[PDB]
């Protein structure tokens, strides 16, 4: 019996923090059931898409959500839920005409950021007269269209700007799944090569719709012509009944985006495990990543762009410092006022009078109901003292209607805004155009911005909505929130717990070095309440205001405007404190896990082509050395050479002129030439060159270096017991793909054996090697590192002692494993050593298998919750100690 389970999921670009919390009836955290960081491991085809499940439509393929027709359908169906109250008792739906005007309005600009107050103003009603508003907290947009207009791919964006609906839809369908039309890729091939290269970085809205384009269009057209919502429209158009409902995609249904997809697998599996183990969660909270899990490369692009941002803003602060002799702290208000003055040409936007840096004041065009204001650049203007004093907390249009001040009006103000020009080198006309559009829009506004609520912190990113949809579908008795990525750091600061967590590192650099911080973030998000989300968002808004004034900030004192709000907030701070207690407790138990999936399937995967290296020819009659023989171009050749009666394990094949072997039927004589793999200049000698992983292909050979599936750990029996390993190449398992990979036979003529340690080869051929168990890259080793005080590793342990948990990152040689610390994140190293940087960041800890096994480390295998797995009935990989 469990009262309340709260699950928290902290989405990252390379990780997913996962936490499960138990709280009492009052919300006090009583037990941290789970806390881990899951690190990511970096026509006869399509359509294989499910058909439309609506009756009569089953011959049509379900449309992807990025299809313009789906975006349109989604907007329309959301608008078809909107209601208008003309009388305090009853609420009527929007008429067809109103619906058309609204949908037109919402699709004018996919890039416009609107609230429902905007829609209420378009409709000609008060905001409070508008109902039926995840339930869309904000108005919908054509996400696909916004993406196409924001892409950095010039030519594509241009083409998309240049019309039209049919062409747009066709192109999206082309880019997403269907190569046809023939119009594309002529349009695509016409595009510059650099852009055509960039094309794979384009991330259309993910998801598969429940219906086909045909049905989407039908339902849309219908809902736009009537007062029916989606339910009714389905009944009337298709005949289905009240109970009819389309299935939703599973959480882990692939969307074609690597990081997103592994995130989805992690989330789905975790939630399954949680519900199975402890029961159905009361709450599932998610902190989305903003921004964003489009890629790691695109994320690094956003990071570089953020560098650019930071530096140019810093340059702005410097400019104010040298231009105005500004002393000390330079507010966002000083910066904005200056920018506005330059833009408005030193004139009040409201009345036109001349202003300067001393005389001008900054105003919010539209006031915001309740605490705080909307602090967007587009809601800020430079104003004279008189206009600002007169306007007060009133919207500009309302104020201007009866201010009776000369040259003050919406028309005059918009006229001024249209006159704005760049005034800066290499500044985008795009951003300026957006800015002018926004300003004019707000100049027309006759209603306040809406008060901040519990949804102000909700993420509006497409993938956030899709994730919400999926989890809520999979857990229909559970409330689901997907917040914006800024909420955990806000929460931690506001509760004052950011320095109380016993994580590795010091409080508190920018980036964190302990990978367990994701588990913290998850725990925190699971604890989030509506009232607290509201309060936090308000505190941020206030902070923005006071930052625009430049004066002393008081927002930290704000913990709610009502009594219940402040009660909730204080209570919550108590809960955060308890959660800190629980987390540190669990950290002491070493039960805040750091996990990573291990790869057990064969590489898909080796189909890619490399430039074939030249094979070297040797006259068979001149004899061969063991090294030359071991690099024979085919295993059958190797067999032929080692089968020879005068073959010597040390001296290879002696020179003979009467030699004759048979390789796959063909006869090879002393005067004939056999081929071997070589990485030496052919003008050199390969008599002593040792064998390396390679396969023969058309025109020579290729190296299968990294392409290793697993390593089998053998104990060569002593005397002096000697541990060794066999790196099994993916190539050597293909024939037995459909079987047990870890028990499949690896013959002596295999390239794997031939590339193994000679001692191990000999041990295996003579039944002197004992199979201990297998490992793969990604596997976790628990190691006693007391005996390692020498070299780079020891110097690393001087700074990070008792670092016992390591991950296999590759096989350095045929006898050396490459390890890196699991709990530590390279992205949080502040001026490290050379040893620390070598172990963590660069080469890693490269350690001989014998040396490593001497301390008897343990291969650790973990389940869906991160817990060590020692036995399994499902024949899943279990943990084992290397003895
Ligand atoms: Mg004002
Ligand atoms: Mg306000
Ligand atoms: Mn986060
Ligand atoms: Mn995180
Ligand atoms: Zn003025």
Structure solved using which method? X-ray
What size, in residues, is the chain? 883
Q: What is the DSSP string of 40-53?
A: -----SS--PPBP-
Tokens for 365? Answer: 């065009």
**Phi and psi based region of residue 11 (left: phi greater than 0; alpha: psi -120 to 50; beta: remaining):** beta
Cα 237 to Cα 73, 210, 228, 525: the distances in Å are 15, 16, 11, 43
Check: CB of residue 329 under 8 Å from CB of residue 47.
no
- Give distance in angstroms: CA of 359 to centre of ligand 5: 11
Tokens for 490? Answer: 């806000």
Per the DSSP assignment, residues forming a β-bridge with 19 are 8, 35
- Of 458, 456, 457, give the one whose Cα is nearest residue 467: 458
Q: Which run of H or E residues covers position 737?
A: none
Tokens for 5? Answer: 């389970």
Check: CB of residue 523 under 8 Å from CB of residue 8.
yes
Cα 714 to Cα 726, 751, 858, 861, 871: the distances in Å are 8, 18, 15, 20, 22
Which ligand lies nearest the alpha carbon of 488?
3
Q: What's the CA gap between 385 and 382, in Å, rounded?
A: 10
For tokens 């795009």, name the residue.
430
Q: What's the CA gap between 322 and 342, in Å, rounded?
A: 17
Residue 249 backbone phi and psi in degrees, to 5: -60, 145
677 CB-near residues (< 8 Å, 6+ apart): 613, 615, 616, 631, 633, 691, 692, 694, 696, 701
- Give distance in angstroms: CA of 348 to centre of ligand 5: 5
Listed residues: CB within 5 A of ion ligand 2: 368
**Start-end ranges of CATH 3.30.70.3520 in the chain?**
615-693
- Of 586, 599, 530, 512, give the one whose Cα is nearest residue 825: 512
560 CB-near residues (< 8 Å, 6+ apart): 531, 535, 566, 567, 568, 569
Which ligand lies nearest the alpha carbon of 368?
2
- Give distance in angstroms: CA of 728 to centre of ligand 4: 35
Sort 345 into a burial class: Cβ within 10 Å, 0-12 / 13-18 / 19+.
Answer: middle
Q: What's the CA gap between 164 and 146, in Å, rounded?
A: 15
Report whether 346 belongs to an annotated binding site.
Answer: no
For tokens 């290729």, name the residue.
702
Which resolution in angstroms does this entry have? 2.8
Tokens for 739? Answer: 């079987």
- Of 445, 278, 457, 280, give the one whose Cα is nearest residue 368: 445
62 CB-near residues (< 8 Å, 6+ apart): 49, 50, 51, 52, 208, 209, 210, 211, 212
**Phi and psi based region of residue 258 (left: phi greater than 0; alpha: psi -120 to 50; beta: remaining):** alpha
Which ligand lies nearest the alpha carbon of 487?
3
CATH number assigned to the domain covering 615-693: 3.30.70.3520
Report whether 363 belongs to an annotated binding site.
Answer: yes
Q: Which run of H or E residues covers position 30?
A: strand 29-39
**Start-end ranges of CATH 3.30.420.10 in the chain?**
1-40+239-299+464-527+570-597
Q: What's the CA gap between 540 and 529, in Å, rounded?
A: 16
- Of 596, 808, 821, give the one whose Cα is nearest residue 38: 596
Check: CB of residue 209 under 8 Å from CB of residue 65.
yes
Please identify every residue annotated as catalytic.
10, 364
- Give distance in angstroms: CA of 668 to centre of ligand 4: 63
Check: CB of residue 263 under 8 Å from CB of residue 433.
no
Residue 243 CB neighbour total at 10 angstroms: 5
Report whether 401 belongs to an annotated binding site.
Answer: no
Report whether 739 belongs to an annotated binding site.
Answer: no
Q: What are the b/e assignments for 52-65, b being 16+ CB within 10 Å?
A: bbbeebeebbbbbb
Listed residues: CB within 5 A of ion ligand 1: 363, 388
For tokens 């599973």, name the residue.
250
- What is the domain class of 1-40+239-299+464-527+570-597 according to CATH? alpha beta
**Phi and psi based region of residue 172 (left: phi greater than 0; alpha: psi -120 to 50; beta: remaining):** alpha
Check: CB of residue 336 under 8 Å from CB of residue 380.
yes
Helix axes 297-324, 332-343, angle to 10 degrees: 80
Report whether 646 belongs to an annotated binding site.
Answer: no
- Give distance in angstroms: CA of 357 to centre of ligand 2: 25
């Amino acid at each position: 019996s469990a009262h309340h389970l709260r699950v928290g999921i902290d989405v990252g670009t390379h990780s997913v923090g996962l936490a499960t919390l138990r709280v009492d009836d009052h919300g006090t955290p009583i037990e941290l059931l789970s806390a881990l960081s899951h690190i990511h491991d970096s026509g006869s085809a399509v359509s294989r898409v499910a058909p439309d499940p609506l009756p009569g439509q089953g011959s049509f393929r379900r449309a992807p959500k990025c299809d313009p027709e789906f975006q349109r359908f989604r907007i329309i169906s959301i608008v078809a839920n909107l209601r208008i109250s003309e009388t305090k008792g009853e609420n009527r739906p929007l008429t067809a005409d109103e619906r058309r005007h609204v949908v037109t309005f919402l699709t004018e600009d996919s890039q416009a950021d609107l609230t429902w107050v905007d829609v209420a103003e378009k409709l000609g009603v008060h905001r409070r007269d508008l109902r039926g508003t995840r339930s869309a907290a904000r108005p919908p947009i054509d996400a696909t269209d916004r993406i196409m207009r924001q892409t950095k791919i010039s030519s594509l964006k241009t083409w998309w700007e240049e019309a039209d609906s049919e062409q747009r839809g066709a192109m999206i369908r082309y880019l997403y799944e269907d190569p046809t039309d023939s119009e594309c890729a002529e349009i695509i091939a016409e595009l510059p090569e650099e852009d055509q290269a960039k094309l794979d970085s384009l991330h259309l809205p993910a998801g598969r719709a429940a219906y086909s384009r045909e049905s989407l269009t039908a339902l849309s057209d219908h809902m736009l012509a009537t007062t029916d919502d989606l339910h009714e429209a389905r009944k009337r158009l298709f005949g289905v009944d009240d109970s009819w409902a389309p299935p939703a995609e599973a959480i882990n249904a692939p969307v074609g985006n690597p990081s997103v997809d592994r995130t989805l697998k992690i989330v789905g599996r975790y939630l399954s495990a949680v519900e199975s183990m402890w029961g159905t969660p009361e709450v599932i909270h998610v902190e989305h990543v903003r921004d964003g899990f489009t890629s790691e490369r695109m994320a690094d692009e956003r990071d570089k762009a953020n560098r650019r941002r930071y530096n140019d803003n810093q340059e702005a602060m410097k400019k104010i410092q040298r231009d105005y002799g500004k002393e000390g702290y330079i507010s966002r208000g000083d910066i904005v006022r200056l920018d506005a003055l330059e833009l408005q040409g030193c004139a009040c936007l409201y009345c036109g009078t001349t202003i300067g840096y001393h005389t001008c004041q900054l105003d919010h065009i539209v006031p915001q109901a309740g605490p705080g204001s909307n602090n967007r650049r587009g809601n800020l203007v430079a104003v004279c003292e008189r206009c600002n004093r007169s306007k007060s907390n009133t919207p500009f249009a309302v104020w201007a209607q009866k201010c009776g001040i000369p040259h003050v009006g919406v028309k005059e103000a918009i006229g001024r805004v249209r006159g704005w020009r760049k005034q800066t080198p290499n500044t985008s006309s795009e951003d300026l155009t957006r800015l002018k559009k926004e300003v004019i829009a707000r100049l027309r506004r006759t209603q306040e911005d809406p008060e901040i609520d519990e949804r102000s912190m909700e993420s509006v990113a497409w993938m956030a909505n899709e994730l919400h949809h999926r989890i809520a579908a999979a857990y229909p008795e559970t409330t689901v929130m997907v917040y914006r990525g800024s909420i955990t750091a806000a929460a931690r600061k506001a509760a004052g717990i950011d320095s109380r967590i016993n994580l590795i590192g010091e409080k508190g650099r920018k980036d964190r070095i302990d990978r367990r911080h994701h588990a913290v973030d998850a725990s925190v998000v699971a604890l989030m309440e509506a009232s607290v989300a509201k309060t936090l968002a308000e505190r941020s808004s206030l902070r923005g205001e006071q930052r625009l004034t430049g004066k002393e900030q008081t927002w930290k004192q704000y913990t709610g405007s009502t009594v219940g709000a402040r009660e909730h907030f204080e209570m919550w701070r108590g809960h955060m404190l308890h959660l800190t207690e629980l987390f540190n407790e669990r950290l002491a138990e070493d039960k805040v896990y750091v996990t990573q999936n291990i790869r057990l399937r064969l590489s898909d995967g080796n189909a890619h082509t490399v430039n074939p290296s030249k094979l070297v020819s040797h006259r068979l009659g001149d004899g061969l050395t063991v090294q030359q023989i071991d690099r024979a171009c085919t295993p059958a050749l190797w067999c032929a050479l080692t089968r020879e009666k005068d073959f010597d394990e040390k001296n290879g094949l002696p020179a003979r002129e009467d030699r004759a072997i048979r390789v796959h039927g063909h006869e090879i004589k002393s005067s004939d030439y056999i081929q071997v793999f070589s990485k030496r200049k052919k003008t050199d000698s390969d008599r002593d060159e040792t064998p390396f992983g390679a396969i023969a292909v058309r025109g020579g050979f290729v190296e299968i270096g990294p392409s290793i599936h697993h390593a089998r750990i053998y104990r060569v029996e002593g005397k002096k017991p000697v541990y060794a390993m066999l790196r099994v190449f993916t190539h050597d398992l293909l024939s037995q793909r459909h079987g047990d990979l870890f028990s499949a036979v690896i013959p002596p003529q295999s390239i794997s054996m031939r590339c193994a340690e000679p001692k191990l080869r000999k041990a295996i051929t003579t039944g002197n090697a004992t199979y201990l168990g297998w490992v793969v890259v990604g596997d976790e080793l628990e190691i006693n590192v007391d005996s390692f005080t020498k070299y780079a590793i020891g110097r690393f342990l001087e700074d990070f002692p008792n670092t016992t948990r390591w991950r296999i990152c590759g096989y350095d040689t045929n006898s050396k494993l490459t390890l890196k610390p699991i709990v530590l994140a390279a992205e949080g190293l502040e001026n490290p050593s050379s040893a620390v940087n070598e172990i963590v960041e660069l080469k890693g800890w490269r350690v001989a298998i014998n040396v490593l096994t001497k301390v008897h480390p343990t291969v650790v295998r973990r389940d869906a919750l991160g817990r060590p797995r020692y036995s399994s009935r499902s024949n899943l990989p279990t943990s084992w100690t290397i003895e």
